[PDB]
Amino acid sequence: SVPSQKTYQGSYGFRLGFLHSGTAKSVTCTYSPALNKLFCQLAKTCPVQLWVDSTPPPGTRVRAMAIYKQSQHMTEVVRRCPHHERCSDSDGLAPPQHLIRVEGNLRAEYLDDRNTFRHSVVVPCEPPEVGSDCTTIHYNYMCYSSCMGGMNRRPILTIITLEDSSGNLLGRDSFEVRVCACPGRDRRTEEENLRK
Numbered sequence: 254s255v256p257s258q259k260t261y262q263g264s265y266g267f268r269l270g271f272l273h274s275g276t277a278k279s280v281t282c283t284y285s286p287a288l289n290k291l292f293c294q295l296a297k298t299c300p301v302q303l304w305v306d307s308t309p310p311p312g313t314r315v316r317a318m319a320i321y322k323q324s325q326h327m328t329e330v331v332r333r334c335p336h337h338e339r340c341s342d343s344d345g346l347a348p349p350q351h352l353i354r355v356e357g358n359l360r361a362e363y364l365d366d367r368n369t370f371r372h373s374v375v376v377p378c379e380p381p382e383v384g385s386d387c388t389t390i391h392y393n394y395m396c397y398s399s400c401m402g403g404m405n406r407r408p409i410l411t412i413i414t415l416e417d418s419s420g421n422l423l424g425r426d427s428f429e430v431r432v433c434a435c436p437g438r439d440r441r442t443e444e445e446n447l448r449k
């Protein structure tokens with residue numbers, strides 16, 4: 254099967270937000286609204302904002318999962334490549350096979366789905382800190398888009414779901430991801446291609 258990617262704000266008005274990091278050669282993570290695409294370096298912090306119109310109940314959680322964007326690959330589980338799954342870069346919580354990690358949250362849970370074999374990482378929802386209007390999760394992507402035997406140059410989407418305590422769907426958003434050495438240059442190139 255294939256997870257849904259349909260945007261769904263739901264009862265709480267759930268949606269993502271991204272910082273405006275620019276496209277300088279030194280940028281490590283940058284988001285293109287025109288492409289709905291995040292460009293990031295390997296294993297670097299990717300801040301993703303969560304926004305709601307109203308407060309969800311205690312026990313609500315936020316899950317992240319990657320799928321291949323192209324239909325002919327969408328049934329294949331997105332996983333780390335044969336090199337990176339063996340490079341012993343564990344943080345003590347993420348299984349070495351998982352592409353997406355959450356940084357700096359000891360309550361993150363990593364799921365290997367018993368039926369679909371897909372990987373995901375889920376955290377409890379926490380309200381914004383005093384003085385802030387949104388909550389930020391820091392993700393890391395642990396393989397390059399180009400990794401042979403893994404993503405192998407195939408584009409991926411990240412699907413972010415807001416879920417109740419049973420795992421039922423409350424909201425959904427998504428974005429394409431390219432993990433690459435020079436995200437600023439690649440964002441500029443792809444935005445230019447889109448304009449042309």
Ligand SMILES: CCCSc1cc(C(=O)O)c(O)c(I)c1-n1cccc1
Binds near residue numbers: 303313377
């Ligand atoms: C379940 C505990 C509360 S979760 C929550 C509350 C508020 C709020 O304003 O009260 C908010 O703005 C956000 I963004 C979140 N939130 C955190 C992750 C996803 C949504």
Ligand SMILES: [Zn+2]
Binds near residue numbers: 333334335337400401
């Ligand atoms: Zn890899």
